[PDB]
Amino acid sequence: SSQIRQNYSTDVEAAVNSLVNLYLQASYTYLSLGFYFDRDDVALEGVSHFFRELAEEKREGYERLLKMQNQRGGRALFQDIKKPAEDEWGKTPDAMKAAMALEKKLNQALLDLHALGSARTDPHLCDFLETHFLDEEVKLIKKMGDHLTNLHRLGGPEAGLGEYLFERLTLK
Amino acid sequence: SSQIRQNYSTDVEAAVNSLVNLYLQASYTYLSLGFYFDRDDVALEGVSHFFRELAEEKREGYERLLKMQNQRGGRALFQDIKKPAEDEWGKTPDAMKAAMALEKKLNQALLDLHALGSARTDPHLCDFLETHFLDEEVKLIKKMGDHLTNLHRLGGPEAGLGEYLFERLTLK
Amino acid sequence: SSQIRQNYSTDVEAAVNSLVNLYLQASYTYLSLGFYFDRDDVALEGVSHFFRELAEEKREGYERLLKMQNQRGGRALFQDIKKPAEDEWGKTPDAMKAAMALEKKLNQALLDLHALGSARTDPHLCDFLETHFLDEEVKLIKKMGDHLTNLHRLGGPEAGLGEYLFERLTLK
Amino acid sequence: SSQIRQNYSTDVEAAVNSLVNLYLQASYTYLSLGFYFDRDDVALEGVSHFFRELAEEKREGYERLLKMQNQRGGRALFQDIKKPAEDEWGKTPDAMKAAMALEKKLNQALLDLHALGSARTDPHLCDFLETHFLDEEVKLIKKMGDHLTNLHRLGGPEAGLGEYLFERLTLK
């Protein structure tokens, strides 16, 4: 067993492994979204780049979780990373809704892990999630909601023009 | 009471206190507008930032009035800052109309205070309002009128798309 | 209803609106204190500047609470900002007592909001208040206790000399 | 006589010459104050420097008025500059009261000249006094009122200690 492991329950370790797998699924889903929006028949480089950055941010997320798992004397157990939920993500507001649902699922898994941490009385886990995750998820769910509201006002029969103007003027 | 007070009448002091409360209500209304346009279901960061800059300019406004009232040996009689007129400001043109009505109300209160300054023969008050307020509110009512005309040209069934393009291309 | 809102109860939202109104009342009370100490018959530019900075720090406070209120998909509801507790704040220790009483009240509303966040199991609220507010208040109540202790040793029949030396040598 | 003279009454020209003589009397009174506070039995370097700067500011004042008198095609009629009101200016609060009485007299003569300019309908005079004088005297009467309040705060049996600390900590 680990020599450094202190106040780090098997439940919190397992929920951190579950959350690592969830950030891996999310990073892999944003890989899929990022490369879907760079398809020739989709061609939204700002939407691609947006999800490419989310894939990187969820990767910094699982790498921070694995670094903390190691710092706590937990064992990183790696499961299969599921295939992303869709092969084709539809239009930008369909993909941005899938991204919203995914970050709200990650934020739920963080909040459940924080409820587990505080129930197991693990201050360092709670601090770590608060410092490195819960504010990132809240800020980027807000960013996703801002995008979804803009994509919604850019809806109606002008939808393809609105989708272009979103990608050009919100997403560089 | 005050040793420095010269030519600053009790009704110019009362009208400067009334105008300070009006710039406080205006700052608080622009705070409400600024934070309304940054809601998830509103998501117009340029419109939000525009009204936050107006909250800051109306803050510098009441702080200049209070500074001048201290320089004139008047007493700042602070009063309750009434809540902003709306909880929800609607679409960007209707918020920009509310901002116009507020800024034309402030400009009316400046013009009425300047008329009172001229009637009491207070040159320093008249100069102060001319230097620091009347030109700011004229430039700003012009800027909001320019915004309302652009938001009107961006009206019709292409609203929402025009609202986004106003925020993207005018307010940045 | 707001689409980003997750694990953000109506109680926490209402308590954040109540605390925004309290940080607005506090900022407005420090506006009143700051401009009272710049009156010609008070003339304590360092005590004025001290409360001018507290008004700004309370304004960072309500603006940051409103940023968080929007990031959580809450609604900023704005009430009247009540008139500051006094028209005339007395001598510097009387004002510094009213300021520390205001900051202990505002820190109580933060601790009550954090207890409500803990009871509603809202990690992001708890983190946000810990990060941006609870240490702001503790440092500032300490600073005002340091000021009150200095203003107390500077008391007695020499209180006018002491009030001047406090403003000159503690408050720049 | 003058070819450039337009809309510049003989009353306003004479009242500007009267005001020039008043700024000369004031600059000369501040010369007297400035050198009285450098006197060896008085020895208040900062109080001396304060009135030395006011002698310079009242000199920019009469030079501005004479430049404007020339720009309006008025003739500068130089009357005798009276003896400063006393040679022994007393303690720092007594001298600061004499300086207050003097700037309030100059500010009264500016307000009277501005009322005369308004009654004769001489806009450039009104603007000139508003731009260069009325704000200078209001700021300076405020500064001296702040000084008098601090010197009164520094009064009582400790008056010599208070006078020294005023000079060392306000006027350096």
Residue A72 near residue A1 (C-beta atoms within 8 A): no
The verdict on a CB contact (< 8 Å) between A129 and C121 is: no
Which chain C residues have a beta carbon less than 8 Å from that of D153?
43, 160-161, 163-164
Chains C and B touch each other (3 or more Cβ pairs < 8 A): yes
A53 annotated ligand binder: yes
DSSP state of B81: B
Q: What angle do CA B130, B131, B137 make, to 5 degrees?
A: 65
> From CA D47, how far away is CA A47, in angstroms rounded?
68
> Percentage helix, strand, coil, to 5, in chain B?
70, 0, 30
Residue keyed to tokens 């798309």? B161
Q: In this structure, which long-range contacts are made by residues B96-103, counting pairs with CB atoms below 8 Å and at least 24 apart in sequence? A: B96/B144, B96/B147, B96/B148, B96/B151, B97/B148, B98/B29, B98/B33, B99/B30, B99/B33, B99/B51, B99/B54, B99/B144, B100/B141, B100/B144, B100/B145, B100/B148, B102/B26, B102/B29, B102/B30, B103/B26, B103/B137, B103/B140, B103/B141, B103/B144
Residue D49: CA count within 13 A, CB half-sphere: 8
**CA B150 to CA B160: how far, in whole Å?**
13
Alpha-carbon distance C94 to nearest alpha carbon in chain D (angstroms): 16
**CB-based contact A126 C123, cutoff 8 Å:** yes
CB-based contact C3 A148, cutoff 8 Å:
yes
B127 exposure class (CB count in 10 Å sphere: 0-12, 13-18, 19+): buried
State the Cα–Cα distance between residues D12 and D128, nearest whole angstrom.
13
Q: Please state whether C9 falls in left (phi above 0), alpha (psi between -120 and 50) or beta.
A: beta
The CA radius of gyration of chain A, in Å to the nearest whole number, is 18
Phi, psi of A101 (to 5 degrees): -60, -40
What's the half-sphere exposure (Cβ side, CA atoms, 13 Å) at A69?
23
Which of C3, C4, C127 is facing A135, going by the closest CB pair? C127
Chains D and A touch (3+ CB pairs under 8 A): no
Range A18-47 burial, b when 16+ CB lie within 10 A, else e: ebbbbbbbbbbbbbbbbebbbeeebebebb
- Is the CB of residue B17 less than 8 Å from the CB of residue B41? no
Helix (H) or strand (E) holding C33: helix C10-36
How many CB atoms are located within 10 Å of the residue D91 CB? 17
Torsion angle (degrees, nearest 10) of CA C26, C31, C36, C40: 170
d(CA D99, CA A133): 64
CB B107 within 8 A of CB B138: yes
> Which pair of tokens denotes residue D165?
């600390």
Resolution in A: 2.1
Give the separation between CA C140 and CA C102, rounded to whole angstroms.
11
Helical axes B135-153 vs B92-119, angle rounded to 10°: 160
Indicate the length of chain C as a whole number: 172
- DSSP-derived secondary structure for D29-90: HHHHHHHHHTSTTT--HHHHHHHHHHHHHHHHHHHHHHHHHHHTT-----------S-S---
- Report the C-alpha gap between C159 and B82 in whole angstroms: 39
Contact B118, B126 (CB under 8 A): yes
For residue B84, give the nearest of B110, B60, B102 by alpha carbon: B102
Dig out the tokens for B167 from the structure: 């925020």
State the binding site of B for Fe cation. Answer: 53, 56-57, 60, 63
CA C51 – CA C103 distance, rounded (Å): 12
Burial class of residue C157, CB neighbours in 10 A (0-12, 13-18, 19+): exposed
B·D CB contacts under 8 A:
47
Distance separating alpha carbons of residues A21 and A15, to the nearest angstrom = 10
Helix, strand or coil for residue A1?
Answer: coil
* Residue D106 three-state SS: helix
Q: Residue C130, annotated ligand binder?
A: no
One-letter amino acid of A105: K
Contact C120, C12 (CB under 8 A): yes
Is residue A65 within 8 Å of residue A23, measured between CB atoms? yes
> Alpha-carbon dihedral of residues A107, A108, A109, A111, nearest 10 degrees?
90
Q: Are A153 and B163 in contact (CB under 8 A)?
A: yes
- Residue C15 tokens, joined: 């308590």
Distance CA B99, CA B146 (A): 13
Mutation target among C158, C169, C171 for the D interface, most CBs of D within 10 A: C158
- Are residues C25 and C81 in contact, defined by beta-carbon separation less than 8 angstroms? yes
Pairs across B and C, CB distance < 8 A:
81
CA distances from residue B42 to B145, C20, C79 in whole angstroms, order as listed: 22, 20, 21
Say if the Cβ atoms of D138 and B72 lie within 8 Å. yes
Chain C residues close to A123, C-beta within 8 Å: none
Q: Which of B2, B35, B41 sits opposite C41 (nearest CB)?
A: B2
Instruction: Write the DSSP assignment of D119-142 as a string of letters.
Output: HHT-HHHHHHHIIIIIHHHHHHHH
Is A13 labelled a binding residue? no
Question: What is the distance in angstroms between the Cα of B135 and the nearest Cα belonging to chain D?
Answer: 15
CA distance A14 to A8: 10
Q: What is the DSSP string of A13-29?
A: HHHHHHHHHHHHHHHHH
Chain D residues with CB under 8 Å of B12 CB are none
H or E stretch at B54: helix B45-71
Strand partners, B81: C81
Q: Using CB atoms, which chains have 3+ pairs under 8 A with B? A: A, C, D
Contacts of A169 (CB under 8 A, 6+ apart): B164, B165, B168, B169
Q: Which residues contact A42 (CB under 8 A, 6 or more apart)?
A: A36
Question: Any known ligand binding at A158?
Answer: no
Which chains reach chain A with 3 or more Cβ–Cβ distances below 8 angstroms?
B, C
Q: Which domains does chain A carry? A: 1-171 (1.20.1260.10)
The 10 Å CB-count burial string (b at 16+, else e) for B132-148 is bbbebbeebbeebeebb
Distance from CA of D140 to the nearest CA of C (A): 11
Q: What is the DSSP letter of A70?
A: H
C-beta separation of D86 from D34 below 8 A: no
Task: Retrieve residue B137's tokens.
Answer: 């509110």
CA B91 vs. chain centroid, Å, equals 20
Which residues have a Cβ under 8 Å from the Cβ of C152 and sit 6 or more positions away?
C93
Q: Among candidates B82, B1, B89, which has minimal Cα distance to B50?
A: B89
How far off is chain B from D1, nearest CA to CA, in Å?
31
* Nearest chain A Cα distance for residue C127, angstroms: 6
SS (H, E, C) B89-124: CCCHHHHHHHHHHHHHHHHHHHHHHHHHHHHCCCHH
Sign of the torsion formed by the C-alpha atoms of C151, C152, C153 and C155: positive
Cβ B70–D142 below 8 Å, yes or no? yes
Cα–Cα separations (whole angstroms), residue A101 to A106, B47, C3, C111, D97 = 9, 27, 10, 32, 73
User: Closest partner residue to C43 among D145, D161, D165, by Cβ?
Assistant: D145
The residue in chain C having the minimum alpha-carbon distance to the alpha carbon of residue D167 is C168
For A149, nearest residue in chain C (alpha carbons): C3
For the stretch D123-133, what's the b/e string if a residue is b when 16 or more beta carbons lie within 10 angstroms of its beta carbon? eebbebbbebb
Q: Cβ distance D61 to D23 under 8 Å?
A: yes
